[PDB]
């Protein structure tokens, strides 16, 4: 007997939708976290609520971390030690909150969503998200710890790649976004620029060749991501 448990899931989902309208993304993520923890799979729309909520939370933290790390680097070039300790301390604080959010997302993926994922679109979506959030840890880690995170991310992305190559057309936006993010992983994190350019080129070309087969809506989703694949390629070449 689970009616009260179903109605709680539905209340959380609804409050997440409200938090999204209100642009209150920390709340949105807490609500979606609760909904995931009720046990059921997520619909396509629920997957996107989950993704949008945590993408905003961790996006604000990464932009913050990048700004502070930029300041801290220039401060270990001048000897400017008078305002020295505070930049380091505050960078480390933001960094720890960033890592906590990624751990939360990774906990949801590995404990609930990846294993209970019905179809193939869903497995690719969650596996890609797993790679992304390890990638976000990798942006702040150093040394051998960074190299272990890289291994987990590469491993999640490669498995999403294998499923997407067999199950989805080259123009599918989830496949395209996965390949884009994997290619960003190769150049900015795993220092595999050749693999990044080769992956971004192949993904762009194979999508380009099928664009004439798409509806107007499919075509707009696919080409928006193709412009990012090419802008990256411009920057990497």
């Amino acid at each position: 007997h689970h009616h009260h448990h179903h109605m709680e899931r539905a209340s959380l989902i609804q409050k997440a939708k409200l938090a999204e309208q209100a642009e209150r993304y920390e709340d949105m993520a807490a609500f979606m976290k609760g909904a995931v923890e009720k046990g059921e799979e997520l619909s396509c729309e629920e997957r996107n609520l989950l993704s949008v909520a945590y993408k905003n939370v961790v996006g604000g933290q990464r932009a913050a971390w990048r700004v502070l790390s930029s300041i801290e680097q220039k401060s270990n070039e001048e000897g400017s030690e008078e305002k020295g300790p505070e930049v380091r301390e505050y960078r480390e604080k933001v960094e720890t909150e960033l890592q906590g959010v990624c751990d939360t997302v990774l906990g949801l993926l590995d404990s609930h969503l990846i294993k209970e994922a019905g179809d193939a679109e869903s497995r690719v979506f969650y596996l890609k998200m797993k790679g992304d959030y390890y990638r976000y840890l990798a942006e702040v880690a150093t040394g051998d710890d960074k190299k272990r995170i890289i291994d987990s991310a590469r491993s999640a992305y490669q498995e999403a790649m294998d499923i997407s190559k067999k199950e989805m057309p080259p123009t599918n936006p989830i496949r395209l976004g996965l390949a884009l993010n994997f290619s960003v992983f190769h150049y900015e994190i795993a220092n595999s620029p050749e693999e990044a350019i080769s992956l971004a080129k192949t993904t762009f070309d194979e999508a380009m060749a099928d664009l004439h087969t798409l509806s107007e809506d499919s075509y707009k989703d696919s080409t928006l991501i193709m412009q990012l694949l090419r802008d990256n390629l411009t920057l990497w070449t």
């Binding site: 395209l176 884009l180 993010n181 960003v184 150049y187 991501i225 990012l228």
Partner: peptide, 8 residues
């Protein structure tokens, strides 16, 4: 960052 990932 000039590099871009997937906006979702």
């Amino acid at each position: 960052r000039r590099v871009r990932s997937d906006p979702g």
